[PDB]
Amino acid sequence: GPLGSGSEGNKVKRTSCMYGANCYRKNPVHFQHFSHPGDSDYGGVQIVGQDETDD
Numbered sequence: 001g002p003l004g005s006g007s008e009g010n011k012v013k014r015t016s017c018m019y020g021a022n023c024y025r026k027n028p029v030h031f032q033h034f035s036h037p038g039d040s041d042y043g044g045v046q047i048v049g050q051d052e053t054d055d
């Protein structure tokens with residue numbers, strides 16, 4: 001089962017990044033391989049402020 005074919009330029013549902021909410025690194029091609037919170041294709045939703053923001 002060979003793999004290794006994930007490349008999204010700017011028109012596909014990119015995979016959320018390992019730390020999209022805090023992705024400290026930033027490259028010109030990394031944004032195409034991983035999506036991030038704040039973009040139209042983000043899709044990670046890993047418990048980011050469930051319901052504790054009432055202050």
Ligand SMILES: Nc1ncnc2c1ncn2[C@@H]1O[C@H](CO)[C@@H](O)[C@H]1O[C@H]1O[C@H](CO)[C@@H](O)[C@H]1O
Nearest residue numbers: 017018019020021022023024025026027030034
């Ligand atoms: N908040 C945050 N954003 C991105 N990457 C992050 C992170 N918190 C931790 N990491 C990565 O996980 C390990 C800790 O187990 C760190 O060393 C980070 O690894 C990064 O290092 C690579 C480049 O040196 C990156 O590709 C990423 O894996």
Ligand SMILES: [Zn+2]
Nearest residue numbers: 017020023034
């Ligand atoms: Zn990232």
